[PDB]
Symmetry: C2
């Protein structure tokens, strides 16, 4: 039973106190996120070769509907880890310095990331990524199930899901208020560990 | 103040007895549909030439965010017309015959359209269109704000919005159930009129 996903890092109701409700997290994880696993497992049932590949291996090598499934699996995993009930505020140490050295300031990064997340048209993802050659951090968008892992030199640090299902239950059309909530839950512990390796 | 949209053909609660609630229609129309109009009016404020263009002219000639706004305006206008509190069932007369002449049967058409609507990944639109050269009817998908008017010989007949905001209030993740509701409100009167010209 080929593919699985980790449990939510902080439980179904983990972000309720900070603006992402138990109901919002339940539909998103149980229906959307697990739905991809379900569909991937069905594809894997008749293809032993596919079943033996990691989600990351699939993202790097596959195309079409099967790519979208693995990509969405990784993106959602990374999304839940990008948030915490103890998130928010600004980072410190290595990451905070790197943000300054790439964006000029935290405020400027926050502006660019907000503008990317709020401005994305249709279904997609706002990322903080690092260029592994230059070591520069950048804001980076993907559309639909796009994933920075398909680009040779990009290492994801953080992501915010901006598909409508990520926020529709709590925020309806109001994605700006959702993104403001993302800033209150953003997990700098996870981001720092991604940055460091 | 340059652009406007028609009122809902059948009122905010018009489809509530057939599976699309007042709430769902209110957010879709008041927030999403009218939101495009507001954003297009802001672009038109400083650009008298754009302000004097029809939405269809913009769809055929402009590119980028301004295209997306006009195309979404047209597409949503067409969507509301594509439904009716008196819709559902099967067409009659000229359109019913043309459906048979293009798909082999109404059932086959319905299967193909349902598969398109349900299967569309990310944000988009399922359409019935006519090729104005061959006269043949086809199921045709657009992604994001894509609009059949950008292709020379396609005339739209009907559309179902499959952006998550179109169904998320009433149906959450369950797009299949939403598409089944679409079949109960589909407006053959609008379809027939688009077909005949
Ligand atoms: Fe999602
Ligand atoms: Fe819509």
């Amino acid at each position: 039973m080929a593919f699985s996903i980790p449990p939510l890092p902080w439980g179904y109701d983990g972000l309720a106190a900070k603006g992402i409700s138990k109901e919002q997290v339940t539909f998103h994880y149980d229906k959307h996120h697990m739905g991809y696993v379900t569909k991937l497992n069905a594809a894997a049932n008749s293809n032993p070769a596919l079943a033996a590949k990691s989600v990351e291996e699939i993202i790097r090598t596959e195309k079409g509907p099967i790519f979208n499934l693995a990509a969405q699996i990784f993106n959602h995993n990374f999304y839940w880890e990008s948030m915490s009930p103890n998130g928010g505020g600004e980072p410190s140490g290595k990451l905070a310095e790197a943000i300054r050295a790439s964006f000029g300031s935290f405020a400027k990064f926050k502006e660019e990331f907000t503008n990317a997340a709020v401005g994305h048209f249709g279904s997609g993802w706002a990322w903080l990524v690092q260029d592994t050659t230059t070591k520069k951090l950048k804001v980076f968008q993907t559309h639909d199930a796009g994933c920075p892992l398909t680009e040779a030199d990009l290492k994801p640090i953080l992501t915010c899901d901006v598909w409508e299902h990520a926020y529709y239950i709590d925020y309806k059309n109001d994605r700006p208020a959702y993104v403001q909530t993302f800033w209150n839950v953003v997990n700098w512990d996870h981001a720092e560990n991604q940055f460091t390796r």
